Every structure is written in structure tokens, then in C-alpha cells.
Design a protein around this ligand. Sequence first.
Ligand SMILES: CC(=O)N[C@H]1[C@H](O[C@H](CO)[C@@H](O)[C@@H](O)COP(=O)(O)O)O[C@H](CO)[C@@H](O)[C@@H]1O
Lengths: 217, 211
Amino acid sequence: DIQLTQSPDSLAVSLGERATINCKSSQSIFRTSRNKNLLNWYQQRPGQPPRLLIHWASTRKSGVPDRFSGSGFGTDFTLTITSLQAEDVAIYYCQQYFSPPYTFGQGTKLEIKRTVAAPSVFIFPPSDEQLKSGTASVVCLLNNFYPREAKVQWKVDNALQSGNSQESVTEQDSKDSTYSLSSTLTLSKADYEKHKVYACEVTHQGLSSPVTKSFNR
Amino acid sequence: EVQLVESGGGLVQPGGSLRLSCSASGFSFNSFWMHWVRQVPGKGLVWISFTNNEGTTTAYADSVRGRFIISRDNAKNTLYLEMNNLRGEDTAVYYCARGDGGLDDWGQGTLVTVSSASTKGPSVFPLAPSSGTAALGCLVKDYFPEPVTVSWNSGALTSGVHTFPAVLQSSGLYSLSSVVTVPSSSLGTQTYICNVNHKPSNTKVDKKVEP
Ligand SMILES: CC(=O)N[C@H]1[C@H](O[C@H](CO)[C@@H](O)[C@@H](O)COP(=O)(O)O)O[C@H](CO)[C@@H](O)[C@@H]1O
């Protein structure tokens, strides 16, 4: 069936500038009898259902800002977003409404390029309630940084931990265009009690030099 | 308005069956095509099925044809998707959508988890305040299946709140954290409680976070 390929896969563009997102179909989706290209464009913000921006390739749905425009014909289409706003952060999809299965493109992730922001760093010791259960989770928080890139290091008594921590990062914030990251170090209570200095080391662009937040059992 | 509400999603055994419902309001239901679309969390939208106005024409994605059956009850303003012989690859959020010029309106979606793993409710642990500004939170550990929701002070605290996407652990159980930053001074004067809800296990917890 009809394949739709978007380019690029991910797009990083600056506030106030213009974003250009292509969709190519494996065959024409112009319906002659309607004189329409049957292509839809959607925006899907973090944690939301998709929102329809454009249908028939170039017709905006009411309520959608005129910053969003669709163009193209036949097998080649483009979504343009003028004067990017922080809230435009989202994954954008094209979809053909020409013949079932009404297939979607693979999506284009839009990242907002903003000024570099340093992460505020915090560490959290395990709770007594958890320790009672036999496990110790140590959490490091890097709050509101940009860009996404960061190395988070766990040092136990200054040793360098590998393969016993997990990270989760939020979606780019819809307002300040920053990310936050959580790192969790997980050890048994037994292993946890045999050490004193737990350290989370954070290196980032917005950091003059690495920052260490730590605690002593 | 237009309101669509999917229901019927949850944890189901591989090979088993489920039937999703989508309740429609705020428009002339029998006047529009209706669609089902799915999405593995973190991944793309995948078109699943549609039916024309009277349900006399339908179609299905290649990967579900012969396994799924879409239907609609116009008198009842309800769309259905019967899903049989479910596979791990069918795990996704399922959306119903009203067709017009495009798929113009979408429900919030319902999560279908196809797995032989047991339902397990989370433990909820405090992340003790770090102290200017202070950070505190809740670690929601060791649950299955997704999802969990978290709020703070019954939704009264929203500014500065970061609820991280869940991570699948080595044990095959999920874990997530919700944190929030607040003025270090308010630690002395303000009560902070994360409200956790893991509906799949009927687990609702309110955990006071204090120094
Ligand atoms: C691909 C597409 O646009 N599907 C729409 C359909 O459009 C059909 C295409 O077969 C056209 O025939 C349409 O131009 C006829 O409209 P109407 O029935 O006279 O109001 O109309 C339905 C609504 O009937 C909508 O739900 C549905 O999204």
C-alpha cells in the first residue's frame, strides 16, 4: 500500500524562524474527481492526541494559526511553519486520505533551538521506607537545561559506577524549551550499607566546569 | 463540543481478545466516517481501521486484517473495535477519530497491553527535599502495566512539576519519578503530597514528602 516518507526525521529550528517539513508519497494521491490532493498534516504535542492542522494538502482547519501552511502536489508535499513558537514543539505527521489503509508518515520531531541553559542539580538519598524493603534507589535530578546533551556520572566512594543506573528525560518544555533529566542508581541495601560517599557528577555545555552533588550515608 | 472517549483497553493475554468502545457526542454521528488509529508509546501513528457512515464499507491495516473487526451503532453513537488473537506487536494506545476533511477530532486514547505478565501496584517512596530553591519528589517504583498518573497537592501544585516518562527496569517492572522545585523557605511552611494513581491495579496513594 501507499508509503509516505517524511524528511527529516528530526528538525531543530530556532524561535521565530521558519520550519520546513517534507512528505513524499510512493504514488500520486491527487483525486481527479475532487481536484484535491488528499493529504493531511497533524501536530502531536507531548502527552496529547494528534491535532489536525491541514487537510486536502493545503486547507487549514479553522482555529489553526496561519503560521502553519501546506503546499505541494502529486507525490511531494511540504508543511511550513513560520515564526516558530515554543509551543510548536511536537511531532508532526503527514497522512494520505486517498486509499485505505490511510497511511501515516513516520513523523518529524520538531525541536526548538534556544539559548544554552545550565541544569540545576539535586541528589536524593533512599527513603527509610524503601531501605526497609531491601533496596536503595539514589536519584539525581538535572532540572531545566539546554541542549539535551549531558553526561551524568555516579561515583560511589569516588569509584565509577557502570551499568546500574537508568535515565529518563522529559519532552522539551512547551514554554521554556528546556529538558529535565532523572538518573536513578539502584543497589541492594546490603551493597548500599558498605559505602559512604554517593556522588552524582554532571557535565554540561551550560556548565563552566563539572558539578558534583553528593551525600554521606 | 465534539467529544470522543475510548474505553475497554487494558492488560490482556497474548492470543486473547478485547473489544474497544468509542463514545461520541456533540455531533451527528451517522454523518461521518470513523477511524481507529494506534500508537506504541514513543513511536509513530499507525492507521488501523475505518468505517463509512453506515458501516457498509470498512478497511483494515495489513497487520490486523482478519483479526480485527470494526463496527458502529448509529442509534447509540458508539464505534467499536473487536480485536482478536492479540500479539505483543498490538500493544499501543488506540485512538478513535472523526473523519471529515481529515481525522479532525481524536479521543484521549486507551492503552492496550498485550502481555502474560502480572498486574502489580507500585510502591511510592519520598524524594526528600535537597535543602534558595529546593527540589523534592516521589519515586513510583515497580509497577505493571502502564500507566500511572501523578499530581501534587490534589492538582493545586503544577508550576515547576516534572513527571518523568516511565522506564522499564531490569525486572520488567516500570518505575517513574515526579519531582517539583519550590522555594527552600516553603519547606518550613508548606505541606507537599504527591497523589499517585495506578488504575490497572486499583492502587491510589497520597504520599507526604517532608524533610
Ligand atoms: C477521504 C474523505 O474525505 N472522506 C470524507 C468523506 O468524503 C467523501 C469521500 O468518499 C466525499 O464523497 C465527500 O466529499 C462527500 O461528502 P457528503 O457525504 O456529501 O457530505 O465524507 C465523509 C462524510 O460523509 C467524511 O466523514 C470523510 O472524512
